[PDB]
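R.M. (postdoc): so does anyone remember the format we settled on? I'll just put the structure tokens first.
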């Protein structure tokens, strides 16, 4: 059903994550980690302490789709077991140095054509697919966007609920 999902999304905050390649999103799905640039890492760390749930909604550039969404389970941390991201051009490895732990809520894709009716008040009411990496999505838009994804019956939201 969708009732446990709605409970997880209650009063959540939402952020758009734009990845330049599929490899890093695949790595994030396998390992449960994400790294972003320091300006967004600061925003996510602040948001993590402010909200019951912080949801990252992922989209790979040029893919025309979202690739799923996940909940932050921790603030960013440094050191740790190394990741091995595929770095875009001009992108340093120390710029992606902060690592967040995430729990996937949905690993299924959603095409942008399916969210064309959703606009984001925090980005001038442009379609929610539009935004830079780290753009915050307002609560009602983010909730409805997450509700559009196909259900991921491989994930049990019971463990997610206990971390709130």
């Amino acid at each position: 059903g969708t009732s446990k999902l709605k409970y997880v999304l209650q009063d959540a905050r939402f952020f758009l994550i734009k990845s330049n390649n599929h490899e890093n999103v695949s790595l994030a799905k396998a390992k449960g980690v994400w790294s972003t640039l320091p300006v967004n890492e600061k925003k996510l760390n602040l948001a993590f302490r402010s909200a019951r749930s912080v949801i990252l909604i992922f989209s790979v550039r040029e893919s025309g789709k979202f690739q799923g969404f996940a909940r932050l389970s921790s603030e960013s941390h440094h050191g740790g077991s190394p990741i091995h991201w595929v770095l875009p051009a001009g992108m340093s490895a120390k710029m992606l140095g902060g690592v967040f732990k995430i729990d996937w809520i949905c690993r299924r894709e959603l095409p942008f054509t399916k969210s064309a009716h959703l606009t984001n008040p925090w980005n001038e009411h442009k379609p929610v697919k539009i935004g830079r990496d780290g753009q915050e999505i307002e609560l009602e838009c983010g909730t409805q966007l997450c509700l559009l994804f196909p259900p991921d019956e491989s994930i049990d939201l019971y463990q997610v609920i206990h971390k709130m």
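R.M.: ...and that's the designed sequence above, right after the tokens. Also worth knowing: Strands lie at 13-19, 33-34, 54-60, 65-66, 68-72, 100-106, 110-111, 119-120, 126-127, 136-137. The two ends are 20 Å apart (CA to CA).
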